[PDB]
Every structure is written in C-alpha cells, then in structure tokens.
Design a binder for this molecule. Sequence first.
Ligand code: GDP
Ligand code: GDP
Ligand code: GDP
Ligand code: GDP
Ligand code: GDP
Ligand code: 5GP
Ligand code: 5GP
Ligand code: K
Ligand code: K
Lengths: 58, 498, 58, 55, 56, 97
Amino acid sequence: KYENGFINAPVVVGPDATVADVRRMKNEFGFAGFPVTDDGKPTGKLQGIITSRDIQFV
Amino acid sequence: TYRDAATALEHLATYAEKDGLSVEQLMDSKTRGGLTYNDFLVLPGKIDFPSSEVVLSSRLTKKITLNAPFVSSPMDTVTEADMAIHMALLGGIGIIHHNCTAEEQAEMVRRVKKYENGFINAPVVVGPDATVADVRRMKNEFGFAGFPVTDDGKPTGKLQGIITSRDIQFVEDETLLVSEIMTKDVITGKQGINLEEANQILKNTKKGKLPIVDEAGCLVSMLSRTDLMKNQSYPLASKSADTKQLLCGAAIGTIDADRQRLAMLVEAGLDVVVLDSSQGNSVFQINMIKWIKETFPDLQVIAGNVVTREQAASLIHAGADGLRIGMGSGSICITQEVMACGRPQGTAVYNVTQFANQFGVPCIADGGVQNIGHITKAIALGASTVMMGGMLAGTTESPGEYFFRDGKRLKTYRGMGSIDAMQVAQGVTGSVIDKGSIKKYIPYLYNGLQHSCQDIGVRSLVEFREKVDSGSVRFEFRTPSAQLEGGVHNLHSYELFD
Amino acid sequence: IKWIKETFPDLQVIAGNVVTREQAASLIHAGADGLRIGMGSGSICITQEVMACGRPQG
Amino acid sequence: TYRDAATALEHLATYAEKDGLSVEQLMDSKTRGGLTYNDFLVLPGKIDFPSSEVV
Amino acid sequence: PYLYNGLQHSCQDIGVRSLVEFREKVDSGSVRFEFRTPSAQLEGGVHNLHSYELFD
Amino acid sequence: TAVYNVTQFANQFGVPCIADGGVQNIGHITKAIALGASTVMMGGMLAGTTESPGEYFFRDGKRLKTYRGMGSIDAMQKVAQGVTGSVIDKGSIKKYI
Ligand SMILES: Nc1nc2c(ncn2[C@@H]2O[C@H](COP(=O)(O)OP(=O)(O)O)[C@@H](O)[C@H]2O)c(=O)[nH]1
Ligand SMILES: Nc1nc2c(ncn2[C@@H]2O[C@H](COP(=O)(O)OP(=O)(O)O)[C@@H](O)[C@H]2O)c(=O)[nH]1
Ligand SMILES: Nc1nc2c(ncn2[C@@H]2O[C@H](COP(=O)(O)OP(=O)(O)O)[C@@H](O)[C@H]2O)c(=O)[nH]1
Ligand SMILES: Nc1nc2c(ncn2[C@@H]2O[C@H](COP(=O)(O)OP(=O)(O)O)[C@@H](O)[C@H]2O)c(=O)[nH]1
Ligand SMILES: Nc1nc2c(ncn2[C@@H]2O[C@H](COP(=O)(O)OP(=O)(O)O)[C@@H](O)[C@H]2O)c(=O)[nH]1
Ligand SMILES: Nc1nc2c(ncn2[C@@H]2O[C@H](COP(=O)(O)O)[C@@H](O)[C@H]2O)c(=O)[nH]1
Ligand SMILES: Nc1nc2c(ncn2[C@@H]2O[C@H](COP(=O)(O)O)[C@@H](O)[C@H]2O)c(=O)[nH]1
Ligand SMILES: [K+]
Ligand SMILES: [K+]
C-alpha cells in the first residue's frame, strides 16, 4: 500500500467527524488526504475532501 | 526515647545551617580550591510541580534572551549555517566560526537569517521569458521552487503571476517559457498591511505564498506558508521580534582586518558578535569593543575568553554586553599545558559571574561541558548560558563528512588553535563519535535540564539563580571515590537517548 | 504517604529516596515508617551525571 | 538592579584580595602541601603588548 | 624556538614583558595562581575524544 | 562451492538461485553471481541501517544495533543454531544500496 496507481478502499471520513478525529487518523495511517463520504464508508457518496492544509492551522 | 514525627519540620530550626554547603562555602577556597564541575553535586530539594512547568529562559547578552541556555561553539567542526539554524529553531543560538573568508562567513550568516521570514525582503523572482530549464536551475541553486513572476525579473517589478514546484514538476519540454506555464490569477496583499493581517490572508487561501504588491501592482514583499509551519513546529525558536528571522551569532578576531569582516557580517543581518580569543583581556580586544559600540551600536558584543574577576571588570568597563568564560577547559584544547595559563572551569564561572552578574552582564560557560549535569552546575555557579563544542560535533547538522575508524562512525573535531585550523599550537586535531540529529539531542538536553531543576526544587533558571545566591540551594563536594560511585561502576558491561 | 496511613493503617511505609536532612524531615512529618537513602550511588545508576543531583552515599 | 558598567574597575577595590591566590598562599602548606607543577595554574592578566616583545 | 616562542606567549597571557618582570610581579602578589584538583587537571588536558593527533 | 554446484544443476531447469549468507561486500556479490547465483541475500550488511528495525544503542564507544540469528534462543523464544550479537550503524540504504 506504500505506492499505488489506483488506490483500493481509500481511507475516508464522515462529515460529522471532528478535526481531533482527523488528526488522530493522520498519526495512525499516516497520511492526511481523506475524501469525505456521507456515511463515512469508502463506497459512500462523495461530498468533499479534507487535506493537511485544511487542518494545519485549525 | 524518640521524638514525635509531627515535630520533624519544627526540629530543623535547631540546626545552625541547612544540610550541605552554600555556594559560598563550596567555592570558599581554602581548602579546597580550584575545583571543576565533577568535584561537586547539587543537593535535591522539595518538589511541588511537574518538570514540564520548568522555564529555561536565559540571557545571552544584555538585550538578547533565549528560551534555552544552549550555544553552539564557533568552530569549523561544529557551527556553520545548518548548525546555527537548528540551534535557533530549538530555542538556543549558534555562533558561526571564522576559519573562513569574510565573504564565506557573511554568506553563512545570511543563510541563517533568511531561513525563516515574516515578510520576505527582496524575494527571488523570475521573468516571463525564462524557461523551465532556468527555473529548475534556480530551484537547485537557492533552492526553493516558489517564484513570483515579474515583468523585468526584478523583485521590484510588476507582478504577472507565479510559478511553483507543482507547475514545473512534470513538464517534459524544458524550453517552455514561464509565461506559458505560470498561474496568472494570483491572490495578493496590499502594501501597508501588517504581518498578522497578511498571515491571515495566507492562511485563508491555503496557498504556498502571498505576494505583497503596491497600488501600481509592483511586488514589494512576500509571505510563505512554510514560515507559519516553522513557527508552529518550533514555538521556542530564537527570533527577532520584528522580522521573525532566526537569531544568528558569529565569531571574529580583534585585528584591524576584522573590522571589514564584521561590517560584512552586519550587512548579512548579524545579531550578536563574539570576539574570539583564548585571552580576551587585551588592549587589542578592548579597542575592538569600543569601536563596535560606536560603529554598530545595535550589535550585541560578547567579549572573552576570561576566567578572572579582573579580566571581567576590564571588558565590562570596555562595554561588553556579555562574557565568554573558559580557558583550557576545552575538550580539544591544551592552553593550560602549553601556556601554564588557565583556570578550573567551575571556579572560573563562579568568580567571574559573582562579579559580572552585579552589572547585569550575562556570562557563557565555555568548555568542559559533556552532559546535562555539567549544564546544571555551570548555571548553578552563575552562568547564564552554556557553550558546547564537542557535544555537538558529530551531529548531522554539524559540518563534517563522516568517516569510519576502529569500527566507529566518526567526525573530525579540531581546536581552533591547532596548526591545521590556523593553516605554537594551543589545540589539537581529533575525532568524535556520531550522535544523530540535534532535533532529538537538544530536546533531550532541554527535558533533562527541566527534570534537574525539578529535583532541585526550582521552577526556572531565574529562580535557580536566586535560590543559589540566597543559600537556599545546597551543594556537596565529591571525593574521587564519590565520583566513581556517582557514575556507572562495578559492571561487566553497559550500554540515555533513543 | 498520607493516603496510605489512613487507608491501610497497618501497612508499614518506606519513603524515599532521600539524601538530605530536609528531605527526611519532610517525609517523616508525612508519616513515613522508614526511609530509603541514596541518590546516584547505584551501580547501574546515572542520576548525578544526568541531573547534577545526588550525594556521596556515606 | 544592576551596577553601571563604568564602575566596573572601581568596584574591584571593594574586594580584600585579587582573584586567585598569591604564590605565598599557594605554597603556604598547610593544607595543602607538597605540590608539583601539575597541581596548579597561573591566572591570566592584562595584555598590552605583542608576545614578540617578551624578553 | 618553539619552546622560546611558547614561553613568550605564556608571559603575554600572564601580562609580563620579561622574566625579570615575571619574577617581580609574582613576589609582589600581582601574579595570581590557582590549585588544580585531579578533575581540573583532566579537564585542563585533552579529554573526551575518540582519538587525537603542537609543532611542525 | 555450494552456489556453484547447486546452480550448475538448477540453471538447467531455469530455476534462479539466491546466494544467502557470507556476503559482506561488493566483491562477494560479484563472486556469488560469477559462481551462478541470480541474486544475493544480505542480512548483516543491511542490519544497522536506518530502515532496519528497531532501535540503536551505544556500547564500547560505537553506535550499534542488535543482530541475531533466527535460530538463536532469544529469537525462538519470541538446541540453538544461531546467536545474538550486534552490528555497527550504517545509515540509510537510500545511500548504501
Ligand atoms: N498513479 C500512478 N501511476 C504510475 C505509477 N507508477 C507508474 N505509473 C504510470 O505508469 C506509466 C509508465 O510508467 P513507466 O515510466 O514505464 O514505469 P513503470 O510504470 O514504473 O514501469 C506512466 O504513466 C506513469 O505515470 C504509480 O505508482 N502511480
Ligand atoms: N491518502 C491516502 N494515501 C494512501 C492510502 N493508501 C495508500 N496510500 C498511499 O500513501 C501515499 C500518501 O500520499 P501523500 O501525499 O504522501 O499523503 P497525503 O497527501 O496526506 O495523503 C500515496 O503514495 C498513496 O498511494 C489511503 O487510503 N489514503
Ligand atoms: N521561495 C522563497 N523562499 C525564501 C526566500 N527567501 C527565504 N525563503 C525561505 O524559504 C522557505 C521556502 O520554503 P517553501 O515555500 O516550502 O519552498 P517553495 O514552496 O519551493 O518556495 C521559507 O521559509 C522562506 O522563509 C525566497 O526568496 N523565496
Ligand atoms: N488561482 C491561484 N492559483 C495559485 C495561487 N498561488 C499558487 N497557485 C497555483 O496553484 C498551484 C499550487 O500552488 P502551491 O500550493 O502554492 O504550490 P506548492 O507550494 O508547490 O504546493 C500551482 O499551479 C500554483 O501556480 C493563487 O493565489 N491563485
Ligand atoms: N509569517 C510568519 N509569521 C510568524 C513567524 N513567526 C511568528 N509569526 C507570527 O507572529 C504572530 C504571533 O505568533 P506567536 O504567538 O509569536 O507564535 P510563536 O512564535 O509560535 O509563539 C502570529 O501571527 C504568527 O503567525 C514567521 O516566521 N513567519
Ligand atoms: N586555547 C584554545 N581553546 C580552544 C581551541 N579551540 C576551541 N577552544 C575552546 O574550547 C571550547 C570547546 O570545548 P568542548 O565543548 O569541546 O569541550 C570552545 O568554546 C573554545 O573556547 C583552541 O585551539 N585553543
Ligand atoms: N542455521 C541458521 N541460519 C540462520 C539463522 N539466522 C539466520 N540464518 C541465515 O543466515 C543468513 C545471514 O547471513 P549474513 O548476511 O548475516 O552473513 C540469513 O540469510 C539466513 O539464511 C539461524 O539461527 N540458524
Ligand atoms: K551511579
Ligand atoms: K583542555
């Protein structure tokens, strides 16, 4: 999973998740590029994306 | 029969003195005299706070204060730009060596000052007629890839767009012009805006840069997102309160030629100068000090080296803003064996600072420092900061090429008085073991000093200074047997950080 | 120490480590039933070199 | 508060003795006695001449 | 000449222009001294190096 | 001798062979391939590099990493045919390889 062309089952986050949750996810995986789906599942409806820049200075 | 335990604290008053020695009694030679760090200990006190609460704010000079009492020595095997940059970021400061041409030293100072910025002065720019090949050559040279695009290719030119690493990153045709690949619509800040205002706009855009332009649309300055990141990652960084640039120190001699050298260092943005000498109490250095205060009145001057009260008085009278203490205490130094002249570092620090502190002149304890214990004791005896040479040699930020010998990873470390460096030697050439990055090593020293203050029962170095002078902090001599017992002993083998 | 004497009054408490008169007085006042003396005197210990803090054991 | 630096040389007179020991005090055994070269140092002073001038 | 030059620099650091002056300033108590504990002697010499290598 | 005699047989079946063990330098790699090996396996040479697990410690004035055989008692504990030892630091394999 270190290098991909098409990433399978990318890590995602729900809209109701907090910045605290996203930072905890960044430390764990550890990247900060999580698309946002409505149900918080990888197969869910895309509603946006959150990146490192988005949470860097929150 | 036995006294009631409830009377334990009250019974302490029946004793004429607190247990252990005052700093006065310790250094009241006597009987015994001429001691160094390893000859004594600081006795523990009362803990009523966490070590994380301990403040290590320290005066480098009259007007300069650091968040940590750590100073890297001006030696060609310890402090160049890389060293000085990271010392400043981690709350200390670096003194750039002068075993080099004036131009080379000024360049090192300049790189330290330009490493972090608030408003970038004269940012690197590119013209629209430049090629991708040119931009890549610029990236390699500076090297950063964010360049605003001006019509004339001057920092003061009319802004027409911006070129970033992402823009050139996967361009196959290097002949393409900047005008073709650049981003034309760029968010800018208006001239006259202050730093806090400019930063917010930058934070809102989420872009790499924020160019500042005048009403005519000409570039005047620029912000960088990474500067905000650097501030966030290094909140204790030693920086100018106005420019946000890292503080930088540099060493010079006291000959007439160093006047031109210093002028070049000041132009590069030097914040503090160290007059480098094994015996600073000279007419030569005194004249240099006087010349600096009238020529560069805003430049802080550290004089030295000194080890006696008389030396200190002489240079303080000359106008020194700080003092460098140590003669022969250096790991790679031999002045005492060659000149018969020097002083045990512990006694030197005490007797000099006992005089100098009365004048609000901070003193650097220079040489003989190898561990956290040495740092604590130096400060206990009156030092405001400690200078480290050998301890920082062999770190990745140190300027050296690692070589292998005796099955050990080594870096060369040499005294500035050694014949090799000058090319009667007062230093020698040697090697030191690898230690890794100071990004780990300095926080270890920082954390260690906090715990040391905690055990002693002081919440800051300011408090530490006060409680020692008042006789509240207590000390104890170490016989040769006590020192062996104090260190590792009676083991077949043994293996601090990481 | 105080919490132990009121919770487990029959339990003997040894406090420490200490090396000064003042430390001893403090913990004795707290109710210590015994004291442990030593700081840096340990064969495998380095507190004195790392903390600049300790005392010759004698 | 801090003393004025201009009074630094004048303030030296408030001390009973110069910093360090006299040769008499060094060799006034005592306590300590029976020392050799490696047991002591000479403290530095004031430089107002080049070493080449030394006779 | 190395010893000669070295002794000149040593006199300079002490602040005396000759051995005659050196003798006088010591006897008058102007030249000052300091004991060296065993720790100070180790600190005064080369210390804490993996290896090391005066004249020539 | 092991690499030569095995590969002289294995090459006839198009089966590539790894030369595992005894490799310490570029010369060993060359000779192993010369004798018929298709690749070389390195253990000790890569131990002590930054990308290798786990943590460095200092002994005898040298920066070391623990290096042990899978047949050592320590390894089998989560008749020994291996031992536990140490190797010097080597830095990143991004430079070493
Ligand atoms: N997304 C993605 N594309 C890749 C990756 N590796 C190679 N490619 C694409 O594969 C194509 C050709 O790659 P090539 O240069 O032959 O190297 P190779 O794919 O590593 O064999 C190019 O379009 C690359 O951008 C990867 O890790 N991720
Ligand atoms: N963002 C993300 N990256 C993944 C995932 N799984 C594997 N990766 C890889 O991890 C790397 C992360 O990209 P990077 O730009 O370094 O970090 P990010 O921008 O914070 O996501 C890429 O090379 C991905 O191919 C995943 O679920 N999410
Ligand atoms: N781009 C740029 N950076 C500078 C200049 N002068 C100093 N710097 C510093 O270099 C750093 C730029 O790093 P970064 O923005 O990540 O690199 P870039 O995105 O490729 O420009 C900032 O911290 C600046 O303070 C300059 O003229 N141009
Ligand atoms: N629209 C617009 N694009 C910009 C601005 N600043 C930079 N860009 C472009 O957006 C892309 C990403 O730039 P940036 O994130 O600053 O580059 P990085 O610092 O290399 O990550 C590049 O193609 C830039 O030319 C801006 O203010 N507005
Ligand atoms: N652009 C920029 N702003 C800075 C820098 N250093 C401090 N600041 C700003 O100074 C203001 C005060 O922040 P401050 O509390 O000093 O943060 P700290 O320096 O981490 O303690 C904030 O707007 C910071 O963003 C820098 O290097 N660059
Ligand atoms: N006399 C003398 N002192 C030196 C020389 N090089 C470095 N020093 C001193 O030794 C200190 C470094 O000591 P270390 O940190 O290695 O124990 C420096 O701060 C500097 O004052 C030299 O060549 N001669
Ligand atoms: N018999 C035995 N072989 C081992 C053990 N541990 C490792 N080896 C082998 O020794 C090789 C290591 O060779 P090196 O690169 O250290 O010279 C490994 O690739 C593996 O094949 C062990 O405990 N017992
Ligand atoms: K010990
Ligand atoms: K020395």
